[PDB]
Homo-oligomer: A and B are copies of this chain.
């Protein structure tokens, strides 16, 4: 259990900030603030993590979602990050993400961005 290891403030390579609490059950709750895109201030996030990971040196699987609507803006989109938490001196969350925008059916083919973010504690 990486409940303690996960909980806190994380920063990615874009300068975005992810603030999360991990629950004993597997819950992830918090806020996300993106340094890029059609976004301002904090957005709610929710997700899940493996609260009983393998003890063989494997990372801890997790994922979370942000819908990009808050009281300032609505970018009609949602991002999900899927990845793993790796503990130890340089702890990291290594993710890949899918950002889907709401589109008309004609534009559905261009609805979804894919990328990768790495989060660190500093």
Given B27, B53, B67, B104, which contacts A48 in the complex, CB threshold below 8 Å? Answer: B67
Residue contact B84 to A103, C-beta cutoff 8 Å:
yes
Residue contact A61 to B76, C-beta cutoff 8 Å:
yes
A68 proximal to B (CB < 8 A): yes
Residue contact A96 to B110, C-beta cutoff 8 Å:
no
Contacts known (A102-B54, A108-B94); A78 close to B69, Cβ less than 8 A? no
Q: Which residue of B lies closest to A67 (CB)?
A: B48
Q: Which residues of B contact A103 (CB under 8 A)?
A: 58-59, 84
Min distance, Cβ A37 to any Cβ of chain B, angstroms: 7
Q: How far is the CA of A98 from the CA of B65 in the complex (A)?
A: 12
The A48-89 residues at the B interface (CB cut-off 8 A) are 48-54, 56-69, 74, 76-84, 86
Residue contact A65 to B64, C-beta cutoff 8 Å:
yes
Q: Which residues of B contact A80 (CB under 8 A)?
A: 47, 63-65, 80-82, 98
Chain A residues within 8 Å of B, Cβ to Cβ: 14, 25-27, 36-37, 44-54, 56-69, 74, 76-84, 86, 94-106, 108-116
